[PDB]
Scaffold this active site. Structure first.
Site: not given
Ligand SMILES: O=C(O)[C@@H]1CS[C@H]2CS[C@H](CS)N21
Ligand SMILES: [Zn+2]
Ligand SMILES: [Zn+2]
Ligand SMILES: [K+]
Length: 215
Positions: A74, A76, A78, A137, A168
């Site tokens: 996806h 985001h 990361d 998610h 998140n």
């Molecule tokens: O929402 C989450 O669990 C994860 C881990 S911490 C948070 C902000 S970075 C990442 C984007 S997947 N996200």
């Molecule tokens: Zn994500």
């Molecule tokens: Zn992630």
């Protein structure tokens, strides 16, 4: 079991001959590294270019072949953070269209948008299915299935055991998320291992765990 870069930054631990997990850091992010006869293939990149460059360095050296493709699960950071590194080294970055659009929306360079709801690929040797089960998610989150090994990369759709809430949820769809998990539980009936997007590797229970966190 587990090799490591000079700084703390990065680790890669084995699951079988040809399949490793990569993990990078304050928060740990996971993906997969697939050793094939035609090159290395990653499921997902990492947080930013520096780390994606290091990950590519570590696996090319160690397995003595090139990273040819990455699957982005996806949009985001990361997942897609090292997209500039990929694109400019000629590393193919597969994704759904949706994920491509969302990347361009968040100001990242675009992946290929080549993946459909189900897409079956092969590298060598290594068989890979990507499945889009629906929203969870994120809007665009897909899973990756290795049928030869019955291995599922759940991504950030799937929570680890140590995870005690949803993380998140700003870009999440908490009603569809349960359905999309079920859609995965239905499609893949015998699962040997499940890799969460964040945390420790597990099995089918990670998915029931995520189901539980959604109640
Ligand atoms: O929402 C989450 O669990 C994860 C881990 S911490 C948070 C902000 S970075 C990442 C984007 S997947 N996200
Ligand atoms: Zn994500
Ligand atoms: Zn992630
Ligand atoms: K086979």
């Amino acid at each position: 079991t587990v090799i490591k870069n000079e700084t703390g930054t990065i680790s890669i631990s084995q699951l079988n001959k040809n399949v490793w997990v990569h993990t990078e850091l304050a928060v740990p992010s996971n993906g997969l590294v697939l050793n094939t006869s035609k090159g290395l293939v990653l499921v997902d990149s990492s947080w930013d270019d520096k780390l994606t460059k290091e990950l590519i360095e570590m696996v090319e050296k160690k397995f003595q072949k090139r990273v040819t493709d990455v699957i982005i699960t996806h949009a985001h950071a990361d997942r897609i953070g090292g997209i500039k590194t990929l694109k400019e080294r000629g590393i193919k970055a597969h994704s759904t269209a949706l994920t491509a659009e969302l990347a361009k929306k968040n100001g990242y360079e675009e992946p290929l948008g080549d993946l459909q709801t189900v897409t079956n690929l092969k590298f060598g040797n290594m068989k890979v299915e990507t499945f889009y089960p629906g929203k969870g998610h994120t809007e665009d989150n897909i899973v990756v299935w290795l049928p030869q090994y019955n291995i599922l990369v759940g991504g950030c759709l799937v929570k680890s055991t140590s995870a005690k809430d949803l993380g998140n949820v700003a870009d999440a769809y908490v009603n569809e998320w349960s359905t999309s998990i079920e859609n995965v539980l239905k499609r893949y009936r015998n699962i040997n291992a499940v890799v969460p997007g964040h945390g420790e590797v597990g099995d089918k229970g990670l998915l029931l765990h995520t189901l539980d966190l959604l109640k």
